[PDB]
C-alpha cells in the first residue's frame, strides 16, 4: 500500500517505490472526490512507478489519495452462458440487464499458441453473400483485411454477414455441432455512427440467441480501446478449443485503436509515429493476430476477421499499410460500383486472397469449386482491362474476342455481385456460374478445363 | 488524354504531394523527443547545482 | 555467481542493480525464476537486463544471477527435429505437457536432455588433436550428423568410449589435456568459427523457380531480397524456396510470425518427401522459428543463433540455405528497443547500432574452405519488408547498401498469382560472372548465350509497352507485336507455376535447357514467317502456340514427352501453314 | 587502471578517473575475453573521458577494468616501400607478414594543403575510356567522383578504370612513367565475393603489383570504416609529395563509410544535422576530400578518384549535397543502359564539367578536343532529349532535320562510350567521333575550330 | 446518464429543399460543412435556425472572423422564428468565442456548450448546436501543449485532439435522460 | 505594439480614421521563432512557430467599427509566399481571421499592368 | 559608421548580355544567383574576374572548398588588370577563407571581412564585395549547435536566422559616409 502520490495526471502518473507491485497489476485509486479507478501498473520502479489512469484528470486530489494492490494481473470470468448473450461494456458489463457469473476465473491478457499445436484448415464458413465465399473463399486459415475505404460505410457491410453465416454438416466442411450460430465480436473502438447503427441491427440478429457482442459503447475512456480486444478475444478461445465450437471474431475499425494508443506513446515518448501513426502499433497486435489459427489436437478456432476502414481513398496514410505487412493479402470492396447503386459492391481486382483451395476441396464444398475459384477472377478481371485501352486510341480497340470478354464483366456486374441481402447456399452461387461461363467458349478455358464442363453447364 | 487524367494522373499527383508531406512532417518526430532530452540535459545540469 | 535484485522494470526490458563482476553479453536471469535476458548497456553497477520473454507478473525485488560468462549456446546433436529458438526453449516439449496454451515466463533447456544417439567414433587414444577436427561421426536419420572438436584448441586424447546409443550428457571423448568433451559442445554467439581460406561462389543454387533463376542468377552463398508489398507473394514464396532445395541442410527462421503466418508452412513438411530418406522433410530441415507474442528481443537473438548453426554445418561440409522471413519483424525489434534503453533515435526511429549484427551476417554469406577439412557454402537470402513501400529506409536497404543478387516482387504481379513475382525492371545478379564456369563445365556451354538470348526478349517488351500505354495495338504494326507476344509465353506459362502442382514447384536443369530451346527457334523462325506478309492475328488462332502452352501442367517424368516431339514441331509445320 | 564503469556497449566507451589526458591516446582495456583492445581517447572529460576503442567489446567484466596509457598521441608509423603488400585497416598485411617499419610517427589526421600551395592541374591520363578523356577529360590531382545509385554497381565497373589507367607521357612533352604510377585502394565495407572478385582483377592484369591495399570488411570493425580512410591518406603524402610520385587513390564504397559515421553522430552528445548523420559532418568529408591536387613545388600528387553509392537518384541526400559543390569535373553511371547491357553506362544530363577550356583543355592537355568537347554536350542533349519531346507533343511532330539529332544519339552511345578491354588513344578518339558527327549539318558543328574540323576530316 | 439509447425519428427539415429532403439526418444526427466558412457558404447557418424543428438555438465559436462575426450577432434578434413570431435572440444561447478572447477562451469553449445543450435536453427542449472552427480550436490547445510534456506529436497538431474531437459527438445526440425527457442535440460541423 | 497601442488613441478617441499597411510578415515570424523557442515552446509547422496565432491576432483585432465611435482603423496586412503556395503556415493563419485574398499574376506584372 | 542608406540608380556591370541585360544588378546592390548543389555557379567569377568594373575587387569565400578555388584562385594573378595590366592582385585584396583554413575560421569569416570591405569603401571606392556561397556559412552557423549540446531551429534550418545574414548584407551598399563620400557595396551572392 502507498499514500501519497507527486504527480497528477491524465494517462500516467508518480506512484513512490515499489516492493510488490507486479507487471499489470490491478490497482484501486480512491481520488478522494468520492471517486473511483482502477488500472495496470506497467512500467514498476523503485523510484516512481507509473500507474494506468483509467479517465481523464480532472476530479483528482492530494487532500486525499490511497494506491492499493488488488490483483497480481489482470483476470475475467468466462461462462459457459456467454454464448447466446451479448455482453455490452467491460468489467461490470452493462447489457443493460444483470451480468452473468464469472464461472470460470482465468486471465484475460492472452493465452499462447503454439506454432506445433497448429494444423492446416478444413473448414469453409458458408455466407450468404456469394461473391467472396466463392472466389476469394472464404476460410479460418484466412485472416483477410476488409477495407471499407472513405464514403464507403463499415457497418453495413459488416452487419450483413451477422444472420447471413450459416452452417451446414459437408457443405461447411465441418459439422454443424462443430459450428454453432453462436459467434464472436470484438470492437477496436465503435464511434456515434457505428454505435447508432447496430441499436437496431441486435433486436434483429439475434443478439440474445446467437451472437455476443462486446463493445466500449463509444463513450467510455480511451484506454478501454486498449483493453476490449483482448479481453473479448481470451474469453471465446476457452469454449473454442476446450470446449470445441468454431467462432469468427469479427472486428470494428482499427482507427481508433491508433486513437487511443497514441496518446500513451506520446506520455512515454517511445516511438508513436510511423508515418502519423504508431511504430508500437505491431507489437502489440502480436497478441491479436496469434491466434487466428487453427488448433492441432483440438477441434474449433478463432479467426480474426478484421475490418477496417481508411482514412482517405488513398493508401498513403499508416492506417491500411501496417496492416497489410503484419497480416496476409487484402480484401477490398472500393466505390467503382457504389456510385450507380451496386450492393453489396465487391471490387477484389487489387485483391490477394491467399489461401482458396485449402479449407475446400472437392466434396467439402463441391467439385467444381476448386475449379470455378481463379476462372471468374481473371474472366471478369479482363472485362474492365478492355475498357482501359480502347479509349486511349480514339474511341475502340475492341476484337471478337474482346466481345465476349467485354460482357464477361456485365454477365458478373448485375447477375452475381447484386444480391440485395439475400441469402445465398453455395450450391446456388457455383451452380449459375457456369451458365455466366458459357458467354465464353467453353472446353478450353483459362483455369479449366475438361473435367466439370460437361457436368456443369 | 481523358483517359489517363482521369486515371492515372490527377490522382496520382495528388496522392505524391500526401507521401512527401507525412514523410518530412514524421521526420520532425524524432526532432522534438530529441530536443526534450536536450532540454532535459540544461535543466538536469543546473539541478546538479540545486540538487545535487 | 552474482547476487543483485531489480531496480526498475521497463517494458519487456528489466534493470538491476548490485552486479558486480557483470560482462558484457551472458546469461542473465533476472528473477528468482529466472527469464534468461541479455547484458547490453553496463552503467554503473546496473546491467541493463533486457528480457527475451514476458516480465508480466514480475515483482521487483527477487535477487538476479548472472552467469558472467558469454552467451553460448548448445550445438552438436539434435539440431534435426529440435526446436532451440530465441527465448531459448523447445516449443515441442511444451506443446504437449503445458498444453496448446503457452505459459509465457519460466526457462527450459534450449536442446533437450531426453534426446539420445548412435556414436561411431572415428579417432583413438593416445593422439593429438587440433581443432575444428571430427572425433566421430553420429548416424541421425539418413544424413550423417559430426562432432567437431572446438575451433582454436588442442590437447591429446585420454581415452575414447566405444560405439554405441547413449545419452547425450555421457562424456565420449576426454582429452588428457582436462576436457571432457560431451556430445552437446557449448560454443558463443560472439566468438564465431574461423575459415582457413575464403573462397568465390561458383556452385548453383537450384530452389525450383525456373524464370527466377534463368533471369538473375544465384550462387551457394549468395543473397537477394524477397519484398512483398502490403503484405503480398513474399509470405509464401519463401515456402516453395524450402519445399525442395539442392542445399543440403534447410534452415527456416520464421522469427516474430503469426497464426496463418506459418500453419501451411510447417504442418506441410511432414507430407513432404525427404531426398536422403523418404519419410518427414524435417530429416534435414531445423525450426529456429519463434512465436510473435514473445518480446522483441526474443526476435533479435533468434537471427544471431541461425547463423551459427549454419557455420556449425559448413564445417560438416553440408551447404546451408538460411532463409529470414520479413524485416519488418528485425525492424520492430531494434526500433522499440532504441526508446526503451533510453538510445537516442537515427533516422525513422531505427538506431544508429541497427547494422550491428546485420553487417556481420551478410559478410559470413559465401563459399569457403573451413578450417575443419570440409567446404560448404553458407547461403543467406533475407526477404526484405519496404516500410514506406521505398527501399530509401535503412531497414530495406542493407541488400542493396552492398552489392550482389537482388530480386524484385510486386503486389501486381502477385494478384494474378503469378508465383514467382519477379521483374526485370528493379533486379540485377552479379553472380552472372562466376557461375559461368560451372555451366559449361556441367550443365551446358550453350547455355550462357541461351539465357541471356531470353532476356533480351523481355528488354524489348519493354521499349514497346510504354508505346502500348501511349496508342493501343492497332498504331503498332506486325513486327512490334512480334516480341510482345513472345514475351506474353515468357509470362502466362513462364512467371506463373502452379503452387499445388509440386513438379513446377522443382525444376531441374533438364526443364530448364529444354523450354528455352523451344522460344529460340519460334522467334528466328517467326522473323521469317511473319515477312511473308502472316499478320499476328492468324498465328493467334493457330494450335502451334497451344501445345508449347503446357509447361505449368507437366510434370518432370512428363519432361521426354515435350522434349523431342514438339522440337521438330515449331520449325517444321508452322513455316509451311 | 580506472575502475568504475559508466557505459559500455560496442566500439564507444566511458570511464571515469578521467580528466588530464591528451586528444587521442592509446590506452589498453585487460577485457574478460583475454584479448587486449586498444582505443584511442579522441576526447576527454569532466571526471570522465571519452575512450573510442579500435575493437568492438563483446565481454568486459566490470569488476577489473584495467587501464594502460601507451602514447599520449595516437599515430601510425611510415615507411618508403609497402610496395606490393596488402594490408588490413589495423595495419596488418593480408599475406601474413609484419607491419611497416616506422621511420617517423606521423599524426593519422594529417595536416591539409594550402590552396596556394596548390596549381592548376592540367597532366591528362588515359583511363582507357574514351568518354572520360573527352568529356571530363580527367587530369592529375582532380576527382571525378562517380555518381552511381543503388542497384547499379560501381566496384565492379570501377575495376575496369583501375587496369586501363596509364599515363600519357608523349602527348605531355616529358616522361611521366620516369617517376612511379602507384595506386592505393582501400574499401570501407565489402562482402566475400568482392573481395576476391577484386584481387582476381588485379591479377588478371598485373595491376596487383606496385599497390598499397587497406581494405576494410563488413566483419572487421565497424569503429574502422571511417578511422582508416584518414590513417591511410597520411601515408599517401609520404610516397605522393616527399618522394615525388604520382599516387593514384580509388577510395570505393562510401555508404559503409557513412553507417559507422552514423554510429556516433546521434548515439552520443552530437547530434544528427542531417539524416542521422553528425552535424559535424562537413569535417568527416572534408579531410577526407581535400587530399589531392597538383603541387607547384613537388612533381608528385595525389590524384584521389572517390567511387560512390550513393542512395537511389535522390539529390537532397548528404552524399550528392556537397560532393556536387567540391567537385569541378563529375561524371554519373546510370541504370537506364545499365540494363542493355554497355559498360560503362554514363548518363551525363545533370553531369557537368566546369573546366573544359580552363583548367583541361589547355597546357600538356590537348586542346583538340577543346571545342570538341563543347560541341558534344549540346549535339548529344539534342538526340536523348528530343526522344521524349516528340511522345509528350504528340507521338509525330519531328521533320527531317530534326530526326538527325535522334539519329546521332543512338549510334553514339553504342560505339562510343563502349569498351571491355578496348583502348583508344586521344587521336584514335577524335577522328572516329568526329566522322560520326557527320551525320549531323551545320549548326550542330560551330563551336569546332576551323583547324580540328578540317583535320579530322 | 440515461435510461435508453434512442434513434432519430423526429422529421428533418432545416427550410432548404435538397438540404433536408435528399439527406435526412434527423435530429440527433452530426453533419458538417466542410472547406472555409464564408463565401456563400453563410446562407445554410443563419437559415437553419429560423426554420428548423429545435426549440433552442446554441450558437458557438472558436476562431471566427473579424467583420463576419459581428454581421451575426448584429443581424441576430432581425433573425425572425415563427413559433416565437418576433426575434430568435429570444430562444437563442451565446457562449461564442473570436480570437480577440484570451489564449485559453477557444480550448475551454467545446465542454461549456456541450454540458448548457443537455440542461435544455432534460426539460424536453431539443437545441440546435452549431459547432463552428472545429479546425480552429485546436490552435489554443498546441500553443498550451508546447509549454508541456503533451506536445504535438501527430501530424503537426495534439495526439489528445483526438481524444476530445470524438467525445464531442459521443454525448451528443436524442436520447432519453433520467427524468424521462428527449430532446435532440443536433451539431453542425463547420471546421474550416 | 508601439504604434499599435497609439493607434486605438487615433482612430478611436480622435474620430480618425488610420490605414495600417504592413509589409513583410516573413521577418516578423522569422524573428518570433527565436525568442519563443528559449520560453520552451516549440516551433510548428514547416519551422514557422504555432504560438503565432495569439500574437498575430492582437495585431489585426483593432479593426472592425466600433459603437458610437465612427472612426477605426481599416487593416491591411502584405506577406510573401514563395508562388502564393498554402503549404506552410503563413498564409493559413492569417486567412482565418482576415478575409479573402488578392493574389498576384505573373502575365500581369511581365507586361506592366499594375 | 555612415550617414544614411541612400536608394541606389547606377548600374554595376559583369561585362554579359543576361546578367546586366534581362535583369539588372546596381551598384550599392545587392543580389542571388542560387544553382542547386553546385550548377556552374562558380564561373560568374571568371566574368567578374578582369571584366567587371569594380575599381577595388575583395574576394571572400566563407570556407569554399579547396577544389573549386584551385584553378579559380591562382587563376587571376595570372590574369591582366583592366586598372592597371599587370596581375589582377593590383585592385583584388583577397580575404577568402577555406575549409582547408579553420573549421571555425568559416563561422567568423562573414561578420569580420565586411570591416575589410569597408575600409576601401569609405576612402572614395566603389568596392566590389563577393561571398562566395553563403551556405558553407550556414553549415558553420548550425555547427554550434552540436558541439554546444542545442538543436538548431526545426527541420534543418540554421538557430540563427536573420540576426547574423541580413545585417552584413545591409551593412554596406549604396550609403552616403560620414565623411560624405559615397560608399557602394556591390554584391553578387553566389550562394545555394
Not at chain 1, 473448414?123 to 450468404?128: C, D, K, L
Not at chain 3, 524484385?408 to 504481379?413: E, K, M, N, P
Amino acid at each position: 500500500e502507498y499514500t501519497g502520490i507527486t504527480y497528477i495526471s491524465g494517462p500516467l502518473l508518480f506512484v513512490e517505490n515499489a516492493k510488490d507491485l507486479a507487471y499489470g497489476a490491478i490497482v484501486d485509486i480512491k481520488d478522494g472526490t468520492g471517486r473511483v479507478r482502477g488500472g495496470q501498473v506497467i512500467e514498476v520502479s523503485e523510484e516512481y512507478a507509473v500507474i494506468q489512469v483509467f479517465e481523464e484528470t480532472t476530479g483528482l486530489d492530494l487532500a486525499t489519495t490511497s494506491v492499493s494492490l488488488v490483483e497480481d494481473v489482470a483476470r475475467l470470468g468466462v461462462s459457459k452462458e456467454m454464448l447466446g448473450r451479448r455482453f455490452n461494456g467491460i468489467g461490470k458489463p452493462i447489457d443493460g440487464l444483470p451480468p452473468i457469473t464469472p464461472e470460470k476465473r482465468l486471465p484475460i491478457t492472452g493465452l499462447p499458441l503454439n506454432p506445433v499445436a497448429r494444423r492446416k484448415p478444413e473448414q469453409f464458413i458458408q455466407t450468404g453473400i456469394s461473391t467472396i465465399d466463392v472466389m476469394n473463399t472464404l476460410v479460418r486459415g484466412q485472416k483477410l483485411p476488409i477495407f471499407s475505404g472513405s464514403g464507403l460505410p463499415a457497418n453495413e457491410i459488416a452487419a450483413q454477414i451477422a444472420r447471413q453465416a450459416t452452417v451446414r454438416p459437408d457443405l461447411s466442411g465441418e459439422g454443424e455441432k462443430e459450428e454453432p450460430f453462436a459467434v464472436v465480436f470484438a470492437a477496436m473502438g465503435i464511434t456515434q455512427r457505428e454505435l447508432s447503427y447496430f441499436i437496431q441491427e441486435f433486436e434483429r440478429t439475434g443478439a440474445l440467441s446467437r451472437s455476443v457482442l462486446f463493445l466500449n459503447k463509444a463513450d467510455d475512456p480511451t484506454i478501454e480501446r486498449i483493453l476490449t480486444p483482448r479481453m473479448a478475444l481470451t474469453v471465446a478461445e476457452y469454449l473454442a478449443f476446450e470446449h470445441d465450437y468454431h467462432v469468427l471474431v469479427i472486428l470494428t475499425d482499427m482507427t481508433n485503436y491508433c486513437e487511443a494508443l497514441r496518446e500513451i506513446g506520446a506520455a512515454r515518448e517511445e516511438i508513436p509515429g510511423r508515418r502519423g501513426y504508431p511504430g508500437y502499433m505491431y507489437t502489440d497486435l502480436a497478441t491479436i493476430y496469434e491466434r487466428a489459427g487453427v488448433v492441432e489436437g483440438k477441434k474449433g478456432s478463432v479467426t480474426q476477421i478484421p475490418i477496417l476502414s481508411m482514412p482517405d481513398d488513398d493508401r498513403t496514410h499508416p492506417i491500411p499499410d501496417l496492416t497489410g505487412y503484419i497480416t496476409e493479402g487484402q480484401i477490398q470492396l472500393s466505390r467503382e460500383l457504389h456510385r450507380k447503386g451496386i450492393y453489396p459492391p465487391i471490387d477484389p481486382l487489387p485483391s490477394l486472397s491467399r489461401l482458396m483451395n485449402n479449407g475446400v476441396g472437392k466434396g467439402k464444398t463441391r467439385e467444381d469449386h476448386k475449379q470455378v475459384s481463379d476462372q471468374l477472377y481473371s474472366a471478369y478481371a479482363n472485362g474492365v482491362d478492355i475498357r482501359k485501352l480502347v479509349a486511349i486510341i480514339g474511341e475502340d480497340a475492341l476484337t471478337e474476342n474482346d466481345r465476349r470478354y467485354l460482357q464477361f464483366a456485365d454477365a458478373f456486374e448485375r447477375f452475381f455481385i447484386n444480391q440485395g441481402q439475400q441469402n445465398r447456399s453455395i450450391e446456388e452461387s457455383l451452380q449459375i456460374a457456369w451458365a455466366l461461363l458459357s458467354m465464353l467458349p467453353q472446353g478450353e478455358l483459362k483455369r479449366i478445363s475438361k473435367d466439370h464442363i460437361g457436368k456443369y453447364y | 488524354r481523358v483517359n489517363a487524367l482521369e486515371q492515372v494522373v490527377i490522382p496520382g499527383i495528388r496522392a505524391q504531394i500526401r507521401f512527401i508531406q507525412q514523410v518530412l512532417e514524421q521526420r520532425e518526430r524524432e526532432d522534438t523527443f530529441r530536443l526534450k532530452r536536450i532540454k532535459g540535459k540544461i535543466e538536469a545540469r543546473e539541478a546538479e547545482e540545486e540538487g545535487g | 555467481m552474482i547476487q543483485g535484485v531489480i531496480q526498475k522494470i521497463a517494458g519487456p526490458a528489466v534493470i538491476a542493480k548490485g552486479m558486480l563482476g557483470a560482462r558484457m553479453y551472458d546469461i542473465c536471469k533476472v528473477g528468482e525464476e529466472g527469464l534468461v535476458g541479455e547484458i547490453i548497456r553496463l552503467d554503473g553497477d546496473t546491467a541493463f537486463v533486457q528480457v527475451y520473454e514476458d516480465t508480466s507478473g514480475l515483482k521487483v525485488g527477487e535477487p538476479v544471477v548472472s552467469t558472467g560468462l558469454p552467451l553460448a549456446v548448445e550445438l552438436g546433436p539434435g539440431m534435426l527435429n529440435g526446436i532451440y529458438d530465441g527465448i531459448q526453449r523447445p516449443l515441442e516439449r511444451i506443446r504437449e505437457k503445458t498444453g496448446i496454451y503457452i505459459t509465457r515466463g519460466v526457462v527450459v533447456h534450449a536442446l533437450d536432455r531426453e534426446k539420445k544417439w548412435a556414436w561411431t567414433p572415428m579417432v583413438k587414444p593416445g593422439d593429438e588433436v587440433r581443432g575444428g577436427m571430427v572425433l566421430g561421426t553420429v548416424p541421425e536419420f539418413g544424413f550423417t550428423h559430426k562432432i567437431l572438436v572446438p575451433p582454436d584448441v588442442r590437447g591429446r586424447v585420454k581415452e575414447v568410449k566405444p560405439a554405441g546409443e547413449y545419452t547425450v550428457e555421457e562424456p565420449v571423448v576426454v582429452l588428457e589435456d582436462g576436457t571432457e568433451l560431451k556430445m552437446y559442445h557449448t560454443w558463443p554467439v560472439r566468438r564465431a568459427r574461423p575459415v582457413q581460406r575464403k573462397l568465390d561462389p561458383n556452385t548453383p543454387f537450384l530452389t525450383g523457380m525456373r524464370i527466377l533463376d534463368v533471369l538473375f542468377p544465384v550462387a551457394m552463398g549468395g543473397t537477394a531480397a524477397i519484398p512483398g508489398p502490403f503484405g503480398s507473394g513474399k509470405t509464401v514464396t519463401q515456402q516453395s524456396l524450402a519445399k525442395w532445395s539442392n542445399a543440403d541442410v534447410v534452415v527456416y527462421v520464421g522469427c516474430g510470425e503469426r497464426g496463418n503466418e506459418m500453419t501451411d508452412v510447417l504442418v506441410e513438411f511432414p507430407e513432404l518427401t525427404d531426398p536422403k530418406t523418404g519419410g518427414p522433410l524435417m530429416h534435414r530441415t531445423v525450426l529456429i522459428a519463434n512465436t510473435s507474442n514473445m518480446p522483441v528481443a526474443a526476435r533479435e537473438a533468434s537471427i544471431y543463433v541461425g547463423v551459427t548453426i549454419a557455420e556449425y554445418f559448413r564445417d560438416q561440409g553440408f551447404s546451408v540455405a538460411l532463409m529470414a522471413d520479413s524485416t519488418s519483424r528485425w525492424a520492430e525489434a531494434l526500433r522499440e528497443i532504441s526508446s526503451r534503453l533510453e538510445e537516442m533515435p537515427a533516422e525513422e526511429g531505427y538506431p544508429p547500432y541497427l547494422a550491428a549484427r546485420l553487417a556481420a551476417f551478410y559478410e559470413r554469406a559465401g563459399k569457403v574452405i573451413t578450417l575443419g577439412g570440409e567446404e560448404g557454402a553458407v547461403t543467406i537470402v533475407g526477404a526484405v519488408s519496404p516500410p514506406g513501400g521505398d527501399m530509401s529506409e535503412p531497414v530495406t536497404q542493407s541488400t542493396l547498401r552492398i552489392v550482389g543478387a537482388f530480386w524484385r516482387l510486386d503486389a501486381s504481379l502477385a494478384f494474378r498469382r503469378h508465383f514467382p513475382a519477379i521483374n526485370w525492371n528493379g533486379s540485377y545478379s552479379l553472380f552472372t560472372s562466376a557461375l559461368d564456369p560451372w555451366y559449361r563445365e556441367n550443365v551446358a556451354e550453350d547455355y550462357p548465350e541461351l539465357r541471356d538470348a531470353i532476356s533480351e526478349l523481355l528488354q524489348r517488351e519493354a521499349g514497346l509497352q510504354e508505346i502500348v500505354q501511349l496508342v493501343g495495338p492497332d498504331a503498332l504494326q506486325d513486327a512490334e507485336r512480334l516480341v510482345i507476344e513472345v514475351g506474353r509465353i515468357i509470362r502466362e506459362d513462364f512467371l506463373q507455376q502452379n503452387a499445388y502442382h509440386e513438379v513446377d514447384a522443382y525444376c531441374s536443369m533438364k526443364k530448364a535447357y529444354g523450354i528455352m530451346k523451344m522460344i529460340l527457334a519460334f522467334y528466328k523462325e517467326a522473323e521469317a514467317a511473319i515477312k511473308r506478309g502472316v499478320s499476328i492475328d492468324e498465328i493467334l488462332q493457330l494450335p502451334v502456340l497451344e501445345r508449347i502452352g503446357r509447361a505449368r501442367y507437366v510434370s518432370e517424368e512428363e519432361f521426354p514427352a515435350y522434349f523431342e516431339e514438339a522440337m521438330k514441331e515449331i520449325q517444321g509445320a508452322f513455316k509451311a501453314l
